Each structure stands twice: as C-alpha cells, then as structure tokens.
Design a protein around this nucleic acid. Structure first.
Lengths: 79, 100, 93, 50, 111, 93, 82, 106, 96
DNA sequence: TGCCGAGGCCGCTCAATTGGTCGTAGACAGCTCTAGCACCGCTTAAACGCACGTACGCGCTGTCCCCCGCGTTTTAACCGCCAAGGGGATTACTCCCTAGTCTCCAGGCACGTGTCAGATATATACATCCTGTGCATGT
DNA sequence: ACATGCACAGGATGTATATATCTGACACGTGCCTGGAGACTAGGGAGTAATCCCCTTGGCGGTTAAAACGCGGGGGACAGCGCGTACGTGCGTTTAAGCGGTGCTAGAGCTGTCTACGACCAATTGAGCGGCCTCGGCA
C-alpha cells in the first residue's frame, strides 16, 4: 500500500490550484490511477535512460530527458 | 471579515486564491517519494534515486495534475456543473489523446 | 538525369514474404515509403539524442536498441528487440 | 504588524468578490503603465490600436 | 589484388530483406553522429523490417476480410486504428486517403 | 426523422473520398497564401496534401466535438463544443 | 486577382465532414465558426510551408514544402513522400 | 591582441561557445561564420525579452530579486511567449491567477 | 578532481545587468534560464539541421537560421528576433 | 340470457437495404534491363570507447515534535429528474452555377549542367577569458 | 543565519594567423508543368417551406460536499555507512578513409493482363392489412 499516500486533501489542493470549485468524492480514487499511469510512463523511460547509461541511480537528467521525450518539458533541473 | 462562510462553497474560492498564488508543492514529499520508489521497483529492482530527481518527478506530476484539473474545469463548466466528476476527467484525458 | 531512392521494392518483397497472394497500390506504397522513413527518422533522432546525452561520438547496437525500447509502445518493443538481437547475432558470425 | 499589508490585498480582493466587480480572471482590476511594455509589446498594442 | 564473386550484401549476411547498406549510408549521411557502428544499421534494418512485417500482416488480413486482394490506404488505416499498439505509435499521423475507423458514438444509436 | 442521418454517417465513414470540392479548396489555399507572398505557384500534388491534412484535421475535430456534445448530454454539436475541443486540446489559450 | 473565397467551403461539405466524424445533428452557428477554424489551420500550415519555399529560393510550393510544415506542427502526413 | 566575436558583433552572448556547440552537436558537417552570430543574437534577444517581462513582474510584486514565479508570470502573460512555451513546465512556477467566470458569485 | 561544468550563467546575468541594473536573480531562476537557453538553442539548431537536409545543403548558415527562427517563434517575436539577428550580422560583417 | 364489440393473434402483401454478376480500362506487375552508381572487399590508419581502479560525494538507513490527515456530524447547495414550450434543424424540392473534365496554349520556372572563387576546416601558438573558490554582505 | 555578489588564481578554451580545397553561388540552356482560358457538361448547392423534436428552461426533491469540530499519527527534521559515480589511466578493438568491381535497384520503356471499379440484379429483411377467435359488458 503506497498510492494512498496521495492524501485526500493533497488531491483537493491540486484541484484547488487547478481552479475547480467543487470536487466529487469519486475523484480521489480515480485520479490516483491517472497520477499512477503518468508516473509509470515517465519512470519507464527514465529508468531506460539510466540503464542505458550503465549507472543504477536515476539521475535528474534521466527524468528530465524522459519528460522532454514525452513532450512535457521541465526547466530548473538543468535542461 | 463580513462574509466568512457566506454561500458555503466560498471558502472554496479563498482556497483557490491561496493555492493558485503560492508555490509550495502540494503533495507530501515522503509519501510521494515512497510512491515513486515502490512504482519503479516493478521495472528494475535495487534502483537508487538522486535526491533532486524525485522532486523533478514531483514537479512534473503537480504540473500535469494542475493542467488536467484546469482542463477538467472546462469540461464541467461546459456540462453546466460547478462540480467535477470522473466523467469530466474521462473527456479531458480522451481529447488530449492520452487514454483512448 | 535524376533519382528518387525509395523503399518501394523492399516493402513489396516483405509483403510477398508474409502474404504471397497480395499486391500494393502505389498510393499504399507511398504510405509505406513515408511510414518506414518516419520511423527511421524517429529512431535515428532518438538514438542520436541518447548518444549526445552520454557524450559518445558513436551510435551502436546498444544505443539504437535503447532508442527502440523508448520509442515503440508495449509488445512491439520486446518483439522488435528480439528481431534486432536475432539479426545482429546472425550477422556477427 | 506588517503582515497586515500582505493580508490587505486579499482583504480588498474579498470585498471585490462580494461585489463581483472582478475581471475575466477573477483578479482585482489593475492599471496599465505603458513604460512597463517592451518595444515588441508596444508594437503589438499599437497594431491592436489600428 | 582480387575479390570474391558475389561478395554478399550485409542484408543477406544478416538474413534480412531490408537494405542494411542503404541504412548505414543514411545514418552517416543524415549526420546523426560522427561515427555509426557496424551493428547499428543491421539492428535498425531488422526493426524496420519487423514493424513492416507487423503492419502489412495486419493490412493484408484487413484487405482480405474486406474481400479485396491489393492493399490500398484504406486497409492500412483499418489495420493501424484497430491495433491498440500501432495506434499509439501512430497517434500523430494522417494516412492520405485512408478514411476513418467506422464508429457511431453509442448514445446516438436508436431505441 | 433522425434515421437517415445515421445512414449518412455509415456511408461517409465507409467511403474515403475528398468531401470538400477541389476548385473551392484550391482557390482557398491560394487566397490564403497570396498575403504571405504574392504569385506563389502550387504544385498540383501539394494542394491535395493540404486537403488531406485539412479534411483529416476537421474530421479529427468533429470527432472530439462529438465527445464534448455527448458529455454535455445533448446530441447536437454547437460552437460551444468546438471552442472547448480546441481550448482543451491546445490550439488556443 | 483576389477575394474572400472562404465561403467556397460550402455548408453541405462541412455537413459531410461532420457526418464522417459521426455527429448526428449540426446547429446552424457551426458553419461560420468552422470556416474560421479551417482558415486558421490553413494559415498556420501555409505560413510555415511558404517559408520553406522562400528559404529554398523557389516560387513553387512542392508537396514536400507542405509535408515538412505538417511534420513540425505535429500532424505528420504519410502519402506524399519523405 | 584578441577581441571577442561577441563584443565585435555588439552582443553579450558567447558567440564562440555558440560556434563550438553548432559543430559539436552534429547539426551539420559545416557551420558558416555568420550562423553562430545570428543565432547568438536571437538567444540574446529572447533572454533579454523574457527577463524584461520577469523584472517588471518582480518589481510590481515588490521584490528586489527575480524568482521562478516572476518567470512563470512573464512566460504566461505574453501570448507570443506562451505560444512558444506551450510544452514546458517551470520548476516551482505555480500558475496564472485564473478563476473561470461561472464559478464566481453573481 | 572533477572537471568544470558548463552554463550560460554569466551571460544571462550580464544581460539582466543591461535591462534591470537595479535587480537580482535567484539561482533557482538561473536554473530555469540556463535550461531555457539550452532548449531554444537545441530547437533552433535541431530544426535548422532539417532545413539543411531538405535543401541538400552542407552548411548551417546565417542565410537559413533566419528561416528557423521564423518557423519556431510566432508572430512579432519572430520579426523582432530576425531584426536582432540582422543587426548583429550587419555589425559583424562590417567589423570582420 | 342471447349477443357483439374490443382486443389479440394469425395469415399473405408489399416496399426498403443488402450481397452478388458483369465488363472495360486504370493501374499494377513484370519485366529487360542498361546503366550507372551505390555498395562492398580488400586494405591502412587514428581514436574512441573499454576495462581497472580509487577516492570522495551523494544516497541509504536510523532519530524527535507539531502540523496536517482523519474521522466525526451537520446542513445546504447542488445535481439529477422531470414537464412543457417553442426555436430551429431536418427533409424534401426546384432551379440555377460552378465544379469537374478535357483540351490546347504559352509562358515561368525547376532543374541539370559546367565554371570557378571565396568561403570554411584544417592545424598551430598565444592569451584571455570563465569556472571554481574564499568570504563580504544583504534579505 | 543563510543566498547572493565580488576578487583571485589557472587551465581550457577562443582568436589570429596560416593554409588548402570544394560548396554552392552563379549563368545558361532547357523541357517540363503549371496557370490559364475556353467550351462544355450535370451533379451539387442556395433558397423555400413544412413540420417535427430536440434543447432550454423552470421547478422539485434527494444526496453528496463543504464545512467546522476535535484527535493522533506521520512528515519534516538531522547522524552515521558505504557503495557507488567521475575522473584518470593505458590499451585493443573499432570504424574511416580510400578506390576499383560489379550486383542491384531504377525509370522508362513496352506491354500486358486483372483486379476492382461502376452499373445492374436478385435476394432477405423490414413493417403492414385481411380474417378468426374470445373476454368482457350487456337487453
């Protein structure tokens, strides 16, 4: 059991930053699935870069490259 | 002062302004770290993580979730609701081409 | 005079390898000669960026294996890697 | 204390929320100063003015 | 000196049908890197060959089940949009004259 | 009423032809291009390639427009939907 | 010569495109916004396509000059080569 | 005595570094002498531009130092920058203060 | 001893000191700027490389980066960027 | 207290969509190249990537304390269902036009070709710049 | 009290200069194919209309979320261990460059067959009246 560490109020906060006024109670356990598949897709690619690089620590570059590949770039971790 | 709780579903807008103004990361670090480690072991056991790389995954996730909710908001408001539901996320995540 | 340099005859030969009865309209040939070329640009571009992301002057079977492992979807990845490793094995003898 | 200066923007933003006078983003309406524009923004806005 | 009669193509040495030579020539001439190791065009040719086998196996089965005997863009579009794997490899492409996968949204159906 | 619309859908999904008339579309391509530069020539193939991209883009938009309408419980599409399907996909704002 | 030729994207053709997309009923406001959306799409593709032709020092737009614009706009198009 | 191609071109950006990277990144087998100058100018222009917006955003928010919020505000306010950066996310950047109009009280 | 890293840091800092002389920038914001410069650089050079091949031309050229920066950048941002590129090359080809 | 209607059910009649048969010419194969130009074998060459190390940095693995997450009940705003109105989208119809076929024109242009010159990559030594660092200092 | 800014040293990088050689700007011939317009055709579209039915709306009732309450657990907070990761080296296998030989991939040709393309037929399937009985109200 680990995904339930994405707490009920954590989803409410993300939704609140996202501008949504009112949240149905079904949202939490569905959204945990969406965050899960998003993390799983970026980790598959990031671990693939790190495996290719022979190292066995996932670097910031391994995840930045995976995110750049998926067209969801981030700036701040040394792009 | 005067309104306080006025039209319940309005401390809601006070939370929108708080979490939209500020730049905390809204998921607890240790829970999120346990999530990425206990995901990644399904594909390679005995990985290490750089202590910033887990935060880079977090900031990508919170950006992705925020964007998803903003798109969900449009789906609810279009469907004449101020309340979001899973069926809104199903629309949004379909139209961006991610799910079906 | 001029030349076009096309994949047309190879995909024709591969069609006849899997469906000995079947043919290709030149419009569908144009689709294939686009598709195989687009996949080639994706995989070469990905292997290149991956080699630059390791500061290596070469690209080799492991870089391009990795590019395929990223860029293809689910079961197409592990099947394609099986065919690539069959081929490189049977070539290097 | 000085934290009342940070709270006062939100106090005004709440009074304006009771009134509903807020803009198309739900913010307090705030004035343009054209000295803050870049030469490119000045060119775009001068084109929007024609 | 002297050289072997029908000194064999890299494809035929690999047992592949895609042109390993042309792939190697393209990988250098497109300038993807200053050096392109001798295995890379073999492996890439095998992958292009395998994807080509996979997509044509589906397209010909679709064309046959559509009662035709020649592939046309329609049959490729029907293969690519039926297969959940190729559809997510090919989410960002249009097949010229391919048409679209025939569907009615379920709520539109009578009764 | 309401039955023959579904029969049109079945027909226009079975067939793969151009739905926009060639001459109007060809004139439109020129009448747009002729303010980036005057007196372009368009190769006869290129106007077809623009049309294939356009009809596929429009169909790919009406597809997600349909999903927007059905999500809003009505069956008839409206400008409200096309604005959403663009606004959520990313072409505007 | 030139004109506002956009009205040549005639109402039945938009109904055909929409019918291939499977929408059962079309509200009459759709047509004049659809022409807007299509014109914006052609503007964005042709803007790039013309600049490839400018760069090649040509006056003739080939099918490649459009296919390359479509590639970089994330709407790749098989069936015209390259 | 040397003089930098940067200052010779009237730029702060490192024209030599740009010329080095344009070879070392494999972008083609040959690089023309004008190409790094022209590219360095565009990088310089965009860097000055994005900072000029961010500086004004920081100064309007009463702060003596630019921090990622002022960059996210800059990038998302001007629609040409937003149209350029539609596929990026800013570290600790937050988002524009948007409330959708229907959610407000009447 | 570990080798030096590489970044645009002093140049972006110097650029700030010719547009807001009064103002500083956080190392977090520098991390974003140093990422943004590398990303825009990799787009322009990476897309220019395709123009070179589409034309079968061997040289990456000022004549043609000028195309890439009107493809990548939208609207007036493109026109003003092309202006700065034009001015820069005009100084450089005068100075040699 | 003898009847016939309302209601259900059966049979043949009948008009729409569907799968199938025919023939002609568009466009595929199947050429023979022919022909030329890539691709390959045989070389010799430089350098890049590999394999072996070890030192030092960055990540695992354990410690305290207040805030946030949880579970609680209350209640009200909202969604979902619904009835009813009437605006507008469909469906059918007629006539006009302009989209398509096609033909032939003639010019504008892409392209191939050959020349040749100035542009750039190569290498080298010199020198100045940018990075890492100590510590002053300002938010 | 930390996160940023400035001065000091140095090593790796940029520039000046020399130097060779081949990219591509250039001029022209060149034949292709595009823009053009004429003439013609009928399938398709614009405007008219009935009339249907959907969407929009007002209104009610049920239930699910916001909300404030109080409780306690678990996230954020710093030590000690050690396994890694980056340099740094020295080595060997790798790949390029090089150029003649000839295998094969192409364009164009001829030439052809045959797929499949429209147009035309022959079903099966749908929904529908003409005939018979009783269940049910009744003179």
């Amino acid at each position: 059991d680990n995904i339930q560490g994405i707490t009920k109020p954590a989803i409410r906060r993300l939704a609140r930053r996202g501008g949504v006024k009112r949240i149905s109670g079904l949202i939490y356990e569905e959204t945990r699935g969406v965050l899960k598949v998003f993390l799983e897709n970026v980790i598959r690619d990031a671990v693939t870069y790190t495996e290719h690089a022979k190292r066995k620590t996932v670097t910031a570059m391994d995840v930045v490259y995976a995110l750049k590949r998926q067209g969801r770039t981030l700036y701040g971790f040394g792009g | 002062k005067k309104p306080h709780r006025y039209r319940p579903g309005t401390v809601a807008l006070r939370e929108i302004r708080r979490y939209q103004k500020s730049t905390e990361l809204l998921i607890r670090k240790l829970p999120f770290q346990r999530l990425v480690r206990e995901i990644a072991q399904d594909f390679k056991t005995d990985l290490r993580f750089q202590s910033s790389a887990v935060m880079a995954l977090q900031e990508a996730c919170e950006a992705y979730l925020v964007g998803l909710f903003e798109d969900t908001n449009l789906c609810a408001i279009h469907a004449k609701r101020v309340t979001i539901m899973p069926k809104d996320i199903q629309l949004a995540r379909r139209i961006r081409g991610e799910r079906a | 005079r001029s030349r076009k340099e096309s994949y047309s005859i190879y995909v024709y030969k591969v069609l006849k390898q899997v469906h000995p009865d079947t043919g290709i309209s030149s419009k569908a040939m144009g689709i294939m000669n686009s598709f195989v070329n687009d996949i080639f640009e994706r995989i070469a571009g990905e292997a290149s960026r991956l080699a630059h992301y390791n500061k290596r002057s070469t690209i080799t079977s492991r870089e391009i294996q990795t590019a395929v492992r990223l860029l293809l979807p689910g079961e197409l990845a592990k099947h394609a890697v099986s065919e690539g490793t069959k081929a490189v094995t049977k070539y290097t003898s | 204390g000085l934290g009342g200066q940070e709270e006062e923007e939100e106090q005004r933003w709440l009074d304006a929320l009771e009134k509903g006078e807020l803009d198309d983003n739900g913010d307090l309406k705030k004035e343009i100063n054209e000295r803050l524009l870049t030469a490119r923004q000045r060119a775009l806005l001068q084109k929007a003015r024609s | 000196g002297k050289a072997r009669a029908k000194a064999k193509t890299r494809s035929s040495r690999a047992g592949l049908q895609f042109p390993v030579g042309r792939v190697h020539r393209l990988l250098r001439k497109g300038n993807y890197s200053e050096r392109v190791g001798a295995g890379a065009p073999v492996y890439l040719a095998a992958v292009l060959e395998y994807l080509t086998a996979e997509i044509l196996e589906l397209a010909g089965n679709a064309a046959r089940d559509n009662k035709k005997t020649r592939i046309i863009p329609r049959h490729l579009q029907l293969a690519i949009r039926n297969d959940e794997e190729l559809n997510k490899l090919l989410g960002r492409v249009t097949i010229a004259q391919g048409g679209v996968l025939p569907n009615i949204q379920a709520v539109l159906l009578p009764k």
